[PDB]
Scaffold this active site. Structure first.
Site, short mmCIF file in Angstrom:
data_model
loop_
_atom_site.label_atom_id
_atom_site.label_comp_id
_atom_site.label_asym_id
_atom_site.label_seq_id
_atom_site.Cartn_x
_atom_site.Cartn_y
_atom_site.Cartn_z
N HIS A 41 0.75 -1.34 0.16
CA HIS A 41 -0.06 0.16 -0.13
C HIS A 41 0.86 1.20 0.10
O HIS A 41 0.42 2.38 -0.20
CB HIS A 41 -0.88 0.01 1.13
CG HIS A 41 -0.62 0.12 2.51
ND1 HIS A 41 -0.78 -0.79 3.53
CD2 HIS A 41 0.18 1.41 3.10
CE1 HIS A 41 -0.17 -0.33 4.56
NE2 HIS A 41 0.17 0.92 4.24
N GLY A 143 2.54 6.17 9.58
CA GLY A 143 3.96 6.08 9.42
C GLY A 143 4.75 4.99 9.96
O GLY A 143 5.61 4.64 9.43
N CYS A 145 3.73 1.78 9.35
CA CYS A 145 3.36 0.46 8.60
C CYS A 145 4.71 0.15 8.06
O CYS A 145 5.64 0.90 7.92
CB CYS A 145 2.74 0.76 7.51
SG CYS A 145 0.87 0.87 8.01
C1 LIG Z 1 0.10 2.24 8.69
C2 LIG Z 1 0.82 3.27 7.92
O1 LIG Z 1 1.73 3.89 8.22
N1 LIG Z 1 0.02 3.99 6.74
C3 LIG Z 1 -1.17 3.54 6.28
C4 LIG Z 1 -2.27 4.38 6.59
N2 LIG Z 1 -2.16 5.66 6.27
C5 LIG Z 1 -2.91 6.72 6.45
C6 LIG Z 1 -2.81 7.89 5.71
C7 LIG Z 1 -2.81 8.11 4.31
N3 LIG Z 1 -2.31 9.41 3.94
C8 LIG Z 1 -2.22 10.26 4.91
C9 LIG Z 1 -1.88 11.63 4.62
C10 LIG Z 1 -3.05 12.30 4.10
C11 LIG Z 1 -4.25 12.62 4.67
C12 LIG Z 1 -5.40 13.07 4.05
C13 LIG Z 1 -5.19 13.60 2.92
C14 LIG Z 1 -4.15 13.23 2.23
C15 LIG Z 1 -3.00 12.59 2.57
S1 LIG Z 1 -2.25 9.44 6.39
C16 LIG Z 1 -0.66 6.10 6.59
C17 LIG Z 1 0.36 5.14 6.13
#
Ligand SMILES: *CC(=O)N1CCN(Cc2cnc(Cc3ccccc3)s2)CC1
Ligand SMILES: *CC(=O)N1CCN(Cc2cnc(Cc3ccccc3)s2)CC1
Lengths: 304, 304
Positions: A41, A143, A145
């Site tokens: 992912h 972050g 993951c």
């Molecule tokens: C577990 C891990 O480190 N990850 C999986 C879950 N994502 C969540 C996010 C994805 N994008 C993010 C920043 C964002 C927020 C809103 C709109 C655009 C970007 S947090 C993080 C990585």
């Protein structure tokens, strides 16, 4: 004496952590030999995570799109492939700190240490158990993951978990290092509910043995039971059924303390039925189930 | 999300552990620069420990009597000196893995990680707190003496504890890295009883804030209290008095959650008076006091 929730020393795993960035997403990677393993992912935008077609998204990615940094030095990506839910990024440099290692897929009830990381940097280490519903109760922020779970046998690190997601209920799901999720979970931002989080009976008994070895003996009673009788009580309390295999694994603890496994089951049965009455066992007011019989022997003997 | 009893990554400290043998006693040493620090009781026979005169025993020891081994390679001892209850063994080689470090003496209520070692080899890592009675509740077997406690601030390891002994009650005592014991304990096999092990109130409140941040909110009530009223209850329950300094330190947690410190004190007051009623907070059936306010912020923010 004393009994603590103890993690393996994390040094061998710290030397493997790297940062992986693809576009705007940064997570952790595990660098072993000339391969960096990370959750697939990392190629998703937050919009993609709702219903991602990973094969299709991966077509738009080239080796140069995967930015891999080990400390403050960049690694050159010369290949990339998807294996189940993980990406394997071939780099041109073998990790000089690669320890002896194996990839293992654990069974529910087994414990492991997690080295929580952010941006390829270690933040902390704690002990987890694979729950009977194939979730883990970790401590993971965005972050984290790609942070991994592992066990150590002298000098060989057995990697068993890579962190991928948090369910809406705050529990965690991930894969082994072949990229197969534990349980029925998928790497998609969708409705995924966990099943019953039952108690790991064999681990509770092991921890009761640790309590006796370390001086906490108030819960020992004058009773015994049978596997079938104990299991009727275990079913009522959402404890996993105890098998003869579990009894056999508790043999060394039974031998060391002189307390027959079925007598300890009867102590556990009374604790389930009567509660703790405001008392504690090894500093806990609940029956701890994240120590395996092997963990209790390891800690009570001092294996390095 | 999720909140775990988390230790610092232990790699930087693993690289400092050595084995020290003097005669028939083998324990752990900490190798920083060209000095190896270890408990002075390494010079004692089991007979000496009853009433040892360390200055007199040390006269019979020469540099060549201190066998220091780092991994499987022997270190050459070119000097030795006693500083309080630790020996400093000057070696001819600076530890090439010496991290940036400091020696700090912690206050009761402060937490730290312990890297339990045997024969200079790391066995496990766990989180401890210096109890208000200056003992720690660790997991230490014979051979673990010389294992150290530490905190990390990015790349600097602050060593705060070296393990020296177990009291007859199964609790542990040790020194800072200047060799001064925490509390009134002495390195002698004699009657040493610990004082009241009171609960670290400021840590419990920090952990209640962590619970709220991580979704466990059932214990929040409609009440408030004052420092003086709360302290009358804290005295009754063997909790440490809460000061304005503790309130100030909880400020960032109060700001993040919007729950005023005194309102959380009133929640804690009701939990003390009514109990948990068979409920849990962050997977615990007791009020956890081995997370400082700094630990809660660190873990809830993801500091590496
Ligand atoms: C577990 C891990 O480190 N990850 C999986 C879950 N994502 C969540 C996010 C994805 N994008 C993010 C920043 C964002 C927020 C809103 C709109 C655009 C970007 S947090 C993080 C990585
Ligand atoms: C904490 C630590 O590693 N140490 C302090 C406590 N001693 C206890 C022992 C001392 N000698 C031992 C072996 C022995 C037993 C009986 C008679 C003669 C020798 S265990 C261990 C080091």
């Amino acid at each position: 004496s004393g009994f603590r929730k103890m993690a393996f020393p994390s040094g061998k795993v710290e030397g493997c952590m790297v940062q992986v960035t693809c576009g705007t997403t940064t997570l952790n990677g595990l660098w072993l030999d000339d391969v960096v393993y990370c959750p697939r992912h990392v190629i998703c935008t937050s919009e993609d995570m709702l219903n991602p077609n990973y094969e299709d998204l991966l077509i738009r990615k080239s080796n140069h799109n995967f930015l891999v940094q080990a400390g403050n030095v960049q690694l050159r990506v010369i290949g990339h492939s998807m294996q189940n839910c993980v990406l394997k990024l071939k780099v041109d440099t073998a990790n000089p700190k690669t320890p002896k290692y194996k990839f293992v897929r654990i069974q529910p009830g087994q414990t492991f240490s997690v080295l929580a990381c952010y941006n390829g940097s270690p933040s902390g280490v704690y002990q987890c158990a694979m729950r009977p519903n194939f979730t883990i109760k970790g401590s993971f922020l965005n972050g984290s993951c790609g942070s991994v779970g592992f066990n150590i046998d002298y000098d060989c690190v057995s990697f068993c978990y890579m962190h991928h997601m948090e369910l809406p209920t705050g529990v965690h799901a991930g894969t082994d290092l072949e990229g197969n999720f534990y349980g029925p979970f998928v790497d998609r931002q969708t409705a995924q509910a966990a099943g019953t989080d039952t108690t790991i009976t064999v681990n509770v008994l092991a921890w009761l043995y640790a309590a006796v070895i370390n001086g906490d003996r108030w819960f020992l009673n004058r009773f015994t039971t049978t596997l079938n009788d104990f299991n009727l009580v275990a079913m009522k309390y959402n404890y996993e059924p105890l098998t003869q295999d579990h009894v056999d694994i508790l043999g060394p603890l039974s031998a060391q303390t002189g307390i027959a496994v079925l007598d300890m089951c009867a102590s556990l049965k009374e604790l389930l039925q009567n509660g703790m009455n405001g008392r504690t066992i090894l500093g806990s007011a609940l029956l701890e189930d994240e120590f395996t019989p092997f963990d209790v022997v390891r800690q009570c003997s001092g294996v390095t």
